[PDB]
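User: As part of a screening pipeline, I want to sanity-check one entry by hand. Below is the sequence and the SMILES for fe (iii) ion. Please return the complex as structure tokens so I can compare it with the automated output.
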Amino acid sequence: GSKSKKVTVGYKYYMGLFMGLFRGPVNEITEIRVGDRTAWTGSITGNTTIQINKESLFGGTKAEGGID
Amino acid sequence: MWWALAMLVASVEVWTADWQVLGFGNFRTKAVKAKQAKK
Amino acid sequence: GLRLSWSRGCPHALYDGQCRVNKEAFRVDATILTVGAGTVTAAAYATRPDGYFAGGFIEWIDPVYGVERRGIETHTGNTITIFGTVDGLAGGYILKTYPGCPRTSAACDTIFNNLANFGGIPSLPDRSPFDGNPIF
Amino acid sequence: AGYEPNLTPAIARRIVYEMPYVDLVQQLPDGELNAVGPNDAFINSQAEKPTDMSAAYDMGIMAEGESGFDVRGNGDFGAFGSLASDIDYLSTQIVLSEMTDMWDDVQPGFVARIAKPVLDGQRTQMEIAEEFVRIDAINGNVITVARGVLDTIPFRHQKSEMLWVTTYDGGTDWQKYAGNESIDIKILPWTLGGGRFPIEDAPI
Ligand SMILES: [Fe+3]
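Assistant: Here is the complex for your manual check:
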């Protein structure tokens, strides 16, 4: 046996996805939710890039889930 | 109320019916109508 | 009302405001060599491969109707077939004839070079769900 | 407004001290309890739960030579009690308040550790009143316990102090830190939907 630095863990998934929301450029996209929980907020007004980083919303090395 | 004017042909408003599907079933919040696809 | 409807092929009508394929880049026209029963023959059509006009339409000017546009259902060699009827045709005025399209991603890419303006999604992920069965 | 949906983490009262031999005996399996040489030491602490939605607390340790408070080892929020009677050395009937939710989970004869405010000069445990008291029987808010049971001579206290029960509870990384290897630590509470407290903004 050994401490959690080298042990079996709850397993991450590694692959992303692609979602078709709806037609037509919109003035701004505000907020993104996961599982009926307010995950990320921000006004996107055009072709751009961001990162969702609050994996704490569901868990991690001590709990399940968490988008990132 | 244009329903009220539509029923101007009546013989005088209770109703009992099921629905023909509309754009209610939710998977993307819309604070404004951007329309949507249909798949 | 049903327009967008994600699919393996774009629902855009060829030459529409969204497919945006140039109206002039794909011109074809020729006077009728011989009219026939629901079919037309012309020299220009022979220069094209089979099915080049599948879903296309023919155009000319009628002394009264002015502009007249009606579709094509099949092409082969010098011969074509029309979805609609023939209102009478004469081997005078040229039939401004437009090619159709299979409407597939490969079709819009190869023939039209319009892949960058395509509305069909090839990688519709077979509706790989996130419920019911193990995945990801 | 959603009828109190907030569950984010927040700071809370905490206390730390060197792990005593009783802690090793209680938490260390006897198979490896032997061979724990005299140069070994263990870290332990306790803290109160700030919110109901809080689950446990992670321990951030930044020992000598370490860069940043490494997150290793976690503990469960033990029951807490606020001394308010200025008990003396020989006092046995402990009159206190702040009956935490888990304050009634201690069985008769349990062991609890008393303490007082800690700061520069007060950090030393030789003089600071750190006394282990064995709780005999609860009397509602007041609890009956013994004074100076295991590794501390009985001492006096003042009202508004803090009392912590540590029987079968605590938090440590199980690292045999050598003596004189003083380290700086910060305990971070965590919640389900809020995760851990501020990454490193917690006190030390
Ligand atoms: Fe096209």
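Points to compare against the pipeline: Residues 1 and 18 of chain B are 21 Å apart (CA to CA). Chain B is about 15% helix and 0% strand.
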